[PDB]
Ligand binder design. Structure first.
Ligand SMILES: CC(C)C[C@H](N)C(=O)O
Ligand SMILES: CC(C)C[C@H](N)C(=O)O
Ligand SMILES: CC(C)C[C@H](N)C(=O)O
Ligand SMILES: CC(C)C[C@H](N)C(=O)O
Ligand code: PRO
Ligand code: PRO
Ligand code: PRO
Ligand code: PRO
Ligand SMILES: [Mg+2]
Ligand SMILES: [Mg+2]
Ligand SMILES: [Mg+2]
Ligand SMILES: [Mg+2]
Ligand SMILES: [Zn+2]
Ligand SMILES: [Zn+2]
Ligand SMILES: [Zn+2]
Ligand SMILES: [Zn+2]
Ligand SMILES: [Zn+2]
Ligand SMILES: [Zn+2]
Ligand SMILES: [Zn+2]
Ligand SMILES: [Zn+2]
Ligand SMILES: [Zn+2]
Ligand SMILES: [Zn+2]
Ligand SMILES: [Zn+2]
Ligand SMILES: [Zn+2]
Ligand SMILES: [Zn+2]
Ligand SMILES: [Zn+2]
Ligand SMILES: [Zn+2]
Ligand SMILES: [Zn+2]
Lengths: 440, 440, 440, 440
């Protein structure tokens, strides 16, 4: 699955549709990012820039100019072609090929942006710019506007109104098209295959990072070169750290291992968590906590649909959690009082769900306490967890248990589609998978 | 292999030894680095900060204060412990454990650095600071010095002399200790095992990124989680791009594939290039170019020793290259004239060797044209290559061939030790390796 | 004459009237400005900040918040009272007295602006801010908006629309109220008295700066402590430099002296130029050039009225100039051709008129080539000049003559009122004034 | 009196003398400074830049390069000549005339400083730069050093040592040459004449600013166009504010007026305070406080000499003050206890003396509590004062009295020379001066 040329074109037109007439929108590319000295991290394009272009180079700027309700055009600034630079660091699109390749009307050299940008903004009323996103972008934009402000004698006028396009653009990104959903569907399968493989490879005495290695290899073999976030492999007490990425410990028989890992496929994030026994067999104490987290997830998967919210479903999860913890003697008291006191918070201290897309924690307005009414096309995670600290004042057997189980879903007309159910989460199915792998 | 507590202590003392009395050296940690939105790249500590500490957290500053030739102390600024932040993002050393853990005299909270740093610099004559390395560091240091400058009435005085410690520290890093050499020796083995595996896995119809996946998995399984640089897998014409990292093409029977890849093991870079046939059998035209690059490497490995230089060995390589290219009809004319005209430069447009250490292109002064006399303990690469452009005006059979063969060496008392010879480079040995793997 | 409390209130309401509902306007005070080391120049408030407040302190910010068409309020941030700081540097209004003194609803400490400003902007749709005016203001505003942008979990939202208020506010300042006109009327009288005195004091052998001293003393004695711009006293060839402020030369019998000087009275600029003979008697050559400049001025004073423009009146001046210069043999050819070739430009290289108000070169849109149709309440200068370079290829007697004659006017319903005609400009009246003074 | 070409040359050589070999010193000019919109304050050159050049333009940089103990040269960067810019804003030295005019070896265009400065610093070991003095200077210097640091392949090397020259240069400025002393002697006379005139002009019902006007006129008529600091005219309770510059009040019969005012003559500051009765006759209560301040001054003038300090003389002043205040019942108790408790500090809350030169509060190290041993050539003020607050709990008659009497002195071989004694300070002489003037 991929995003078509036509889709990128549709998105640009959808942005232009919302823009005032006599305006320009400026969308800047991500800078290259140093890892150490002269070596740089693998390039990751700005998600919003990528959303409108599918162009994976730095030093680029998309300019969408709306003259009126029927008349608009696009200008790309991008790196010029350079034989020496390209022999050394890799091929560049350049200006000639860009209009056709990316469906823009005009392409200019990024090295001329200071000489040309003010001319494109001259006489407009409004400029859409994400102020503070990148310092290099702010310098370029402020410099253009100052030229215009101070160029009265040259008959130049700056637009007096600057609008942040991020709210508009993030609202667009919040609702996935069919093409985006097909891509996220594949990201979900790829990620699921990685998680299955980790379960099948796990043995006592392997290190946490070994499962990371298996996962990343599986991502790569399906064409997802990079993870969407730094992989989490927390065995034992490390499972109680939500974004544990050290992955440095020997995995011990008797411990659980929590894997939070997701591929990046055509820019889109998969995001799965599976927790399972290092030795392939859950203990009673492990099952007792796992079953609460699993019921929370399964109930949420049943409930999520148009017209509810993350807040409303979270309320049900809290009830399931508080009830289960009371039955185990981890909480003491009346269930409804304990709920009213948020007595679950020492053990479940994060949200049930986040938006998912070009960013793993995706853009889009949640509303107060994530109360926004869900509609079809929204994509989100469902990730209940219980994390009992090594030093929690609870029965000894539950201490140092961290369990999270996470699926990715898209809201549909009648409910939701689960993108990540091809990896098992029922404990008996986990155990069968691991037994079968140990034979073979 | 690892770097000991004692070694980090020795390095600090070696820096202090060279410092003026009545001075302080400020070594700042790398910032965290955004990959996209709220997600960050895997943390990579500043190499120089790491060199003196082995401490892998951001928001940290090592302060070495020399009062006189016998009297000095160390202060660390680092992140305070925070239960919520650590539950979320991971464990922190904190102040209590730091003196013992890292062998410093005193540890303070980074959040108090603006309140405390000027007090440590008050009344000193000299401050060693790497100005321009990081903007956050410059703000902190300039702010401290301004307080002192303007604090005459509070009996404060700023040091008037600021010295860049990078030349001193990079000169130290240029000469590897026995411990560092043992670590780089292991990085070389790990990297070699990855390259062998790539050769054994390569088949026509696999993508360039699949060999990347195999390599990264092999790095990871030996405890080297990350590469030291972005892996290069250039098959066909992509082999003519020196830092080709797109790795996006289907590998075709008949093409060569050039793999430049290195692990990062305890901070230290492995760095190997092997070029080989995708189908396991070199053609005549491929052998003809390969043999020139291989003779260049083998001759350089024989020559490199104390008392020569990269420049001097490069001169021999150029002769080998120009002679081979004339025999193939790629160059025409007198060998010595062609050498004097640098007629090899369209086909070999980079240096034979770079320093290797905590950075893959390591710090340390090369001298003009890399003429510095080599001494024992210097670690460097040997990487001749020939890159014939798809459109070069040469016999058709050589067009679009990129070949590089690279080993990592340490200069010894009598010559050099090759750290990467455990992966094959003789063409018949490459072919036997790939045949054996294809059976199975 | 002064500006009333009620007037400042009317201006604020007039700004609020034009603002969108659910918006705030931020108007920042001028910074203190170093002259050398720890000494600062006399404080000059930002003209726009002054326009809305009449408040003459630094570290202050006026915030006008419009909730809707009937509901708005004002918040001032200003310096807190401080006995030690005030004993040392002077009295401060503080917070208690400010509401009553300046007619604002609320006053807060400037030292708390970062803790309070984001709370005032929370949930608004629009912020009016003069971006780039002052760096300290930009830091404060950007910092407030980032808090809001990133404060989703604390139920904070930034206004997405930022509008430059300078066009709106400068359009207001372009039209003077009756109160402003009475103040500028007094500034014109004060400035005129200074110019008369300079003419009466001038003798050969006095320095250019001596007339500056006389002028500044006269400004001061009527309560205008500072000039509105740096005083120009160009005798001889120095009269050909438009903003000659060195004022360092001995004034020589036989030379003319050009004085461009204006007081600052209650913030408003007077702006007069008178050129006259150092020895009290114009030569023939001096009269010949002077009469052209004087006819230009007198004709412009007759012409300026509602419905014409600076451009249209300039056209008449150019004709008068080109004709006069042709009669003297300074220009050669057909008058209408010479006009079409702008042949006057080597001798008259500036505009006839600029807006006048809180700035000597006042704010307000001119239109292309100063073609804006004049309306009642506009205040402007009328300043024709002829400047014949020492090395101009013209008859010897005209070389090194610089003459400018400038009056300040307000456009009325039927024409204009001259604010500066109480100082003489007819040459015979100049000569009589100087003769009478010499007796003284 | 003036500073000779030879003197500026001597100063430069004296700086070069102290510089390390293989070094360059960079001394930058002051920026132009906005007063409001497009109008700028009268230009004031950086004191240190002026000290070495006598050059009064912005956008200039003096570069002194020391190759070794006998070999050095000077390069000036300055504004290029421009007919249009000079016709508009005034004449420029340019490059051709600069070597001869300012005694430098070479002059280059400031517009080429980024292309040329790094070439001048290439291969040096040390750069002397006043870091943080001006932001534009820091940008230029850091930019030059980064080019060198990163220009290894172009055989460029940055100096690794940066030294602040301000301590060295301010130590030089602390000791005035005979030429400087003659200039300050004239500044003292000019300032004295202004103060005498203010006393002679003062009448009840005149405003504080009227005396300011008289003073500034007198400065100007002797060729000192500007004051060295903003003039202080505090009548009544305004005399209790140390840097009262509002000068806005009507001067009332019965009140004292305190005038702190100084000219700037050839860059050098005069600095005098005289306090006197508005009506020409001191009351008993006024005399009682005045006599304490006058004895303090007269005793200090007797005491100041080589080998004492400001601290040591201040101790005597404190004794005189505490004793006088006890006799008046303003302080109660034992004199020596009151001294030990610093009981004078509510009434005398500033230092007796500051260095005087190119800045009114001149550069140079004071030592702890101004304990530095005085040597010949040091120039300083002597300014005791007593300031009794309107609300001080003291006998009613002393409330709201501010008195300061200040002279400027140079330390000589045997004592001091008073530069400002040509204006009267004995009360009977003040009264006679004012009576004589009233007849006017
Ligand atoms: C940043 C958030 C949108 C997601 C995060 N997992 C939370 O629940 O708090
Ligand atoms: C940056 C250099 C030290 C290394 C690079 N491979 C070259 O030879 O040019
Ligand atoms: C800056 C302008 C408004 C005024 C200037 N005197 C000119 O005519 O060019
Ligand atoms: C700034 C100081 C050197 C001078 C000031 N008058 C004081 O005595 O405190
Ligand atoms: O952030 C957020 C969720 C919490 C567990 C991991 N990711
Ligand atoms: O850079 C440098 C060498 C050239 C080939 C890859 N690395
Ligand atoms: O600027 C403008 C006009 C030109 C002469 C002086 N002021
Ligand atoms: O500053 C200092 C002294 C105190 C009075 C005025 N100047
Ligand atoms: Mg346990
Ligand atoms: Mg071929
Ligand atoms: Mg003449
Ligand atoms: Mg009284
Ligand atoms: Zn069009
Ligand atoms: Zn997360
Ligand atoms: Zn997850
Ligand atoms: Zn998630
Ligand atoms: Zn010690
Ligand atoms: Zn490389
Ligand atoms: Zn390599
Ligand atoms: Zn290499
Ligand atoms: Zn209200
Ligand atoms: Zn002007
Ligand atoms: Zn004027
Ligand atoms: Zn004017
Ligand atoms: Zn020389
Ligand atoms: Zn002072
Ligand atoms: Zn003074
Ligand atoms: Zn003083």
């Amino acid at each position: 699955s991929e995003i078509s040329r036509q889709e990128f074109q549709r998105r640009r037109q959808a942005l232009v549709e919302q823009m005032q007439p006599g305006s320009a929108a400026l969308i800047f590319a991500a800078p290259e990012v140093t890892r150490s000295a002269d070596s740089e991290y693998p390039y990751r394009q700005n998600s919003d820039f990528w959303y409108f272009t599918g162009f994976n180079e730095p030093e680029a700027v998309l300019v969408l100019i709306k003259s009126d309700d029927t008349h608009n055009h696009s200008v790309l600034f991008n790196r010029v072609r350079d034989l020496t630079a390209e022999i050394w660091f890799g091929r560049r699109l350049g200006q000639d090929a860009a209009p056709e390749k990316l469906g823009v009307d005009r392409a200019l050299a990024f090295s001329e942006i200071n000489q040309q940008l003010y001319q494109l903004l001259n006489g407009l009323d409004v400029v859409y710019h994400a102020q503070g996103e990148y310092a290099y972008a702010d310098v370029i934009v402020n410099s253009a506007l100052e030229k215009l402000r101070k160029g009265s004698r040259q008959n130049l006028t700056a637009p007096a109104t600057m609008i942040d396009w991020r709210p508009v653009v993030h609202e667009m990104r919040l609702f996935k098209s069919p093409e985006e959903i097909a891509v996220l569907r594949r990201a979900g399968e790829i990620t699921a295959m990685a998680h299955t493989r980790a379960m099948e490879k796990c043995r006592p005495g392997m290190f946490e990072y070994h499962l990371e290695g298996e996962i990343h290899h599986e991502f790569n073999r399906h064409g997802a070169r990079y993870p969407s976030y730094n992989t989490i492999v927390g065995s034992g007490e490390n499972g109680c750290i939500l974004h544990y990425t050290e992955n440095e410990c020997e995995m011990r028989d008797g411990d659980l291992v929590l894997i939070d890992a997701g591929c990046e496929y055509k820019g889109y994030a998969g995001d799965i968590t599976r927790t399972f026994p290092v030795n392939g067999k859950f203990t009673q104490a492990q099952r007792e906590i796992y079953d609460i987290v699993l019921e929370s997830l399964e109930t949420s998967l049943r409930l999520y649909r148009p017209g509810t919210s993350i807040l409303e479903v979270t309320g049900e999860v809290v009830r399931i959690m508080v009830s289960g913890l009371v039955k185990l003697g981890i909480l003491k008291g009346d269930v409804d009082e304990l709920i009213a006191q948020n007595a679950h918070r020492p053990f479940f201290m994060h949200g049930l769900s986040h938006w998912l897309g070009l960013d793993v924690h995706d853009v889009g307005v949640y509303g107060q306490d994530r109360s926004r009414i869900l509609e079809p096309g929204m994509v989100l995670t469902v990730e209940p967890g219980l994390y009992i600290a090594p030093d929690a004042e609870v029965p000894e057997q539950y201490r140092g248990i961290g369990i999270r189980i996470e699926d990715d879903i898209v809201i549909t007309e009648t409910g939701n589609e689960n993108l990540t159910a091809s990896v098992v989460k029922k404990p008996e199915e986990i155990e069968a998978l691991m037994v079968a792998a140990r034979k073979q």
